[PDB]
């Protein structure tokens, strides 16, 4: 019934941006606008996938 924040993880496998980092938000698709802006901060043109399982998303090249 309470709406949580839940921890989302972001693997990143860009050109010139690797590693890992993480947000919180109460759903996945506010996640993936925090992290998609993050990465295009950071200069990343890459493609995504979204980990449902394990509420991870991961951007490659």
Do not use: S
């Not at 606008?33 to 979204?50: C, I, L, M, R």
């Amino acid at each position: 019934h309470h709406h949580a924040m839940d921890t989302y993880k972001l693997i990143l496998n860009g050109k010139t941006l690797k590693g890992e980092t993480t947000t919180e938000a109460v759903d996945a698709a506010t996640a993936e606008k925090v992290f998609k802006q993050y990465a295009n901060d950071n200069g990343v043109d890459g493609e995504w996938t979204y980990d449902d399982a394990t509420k991870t998303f991961t951007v490659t090249e």
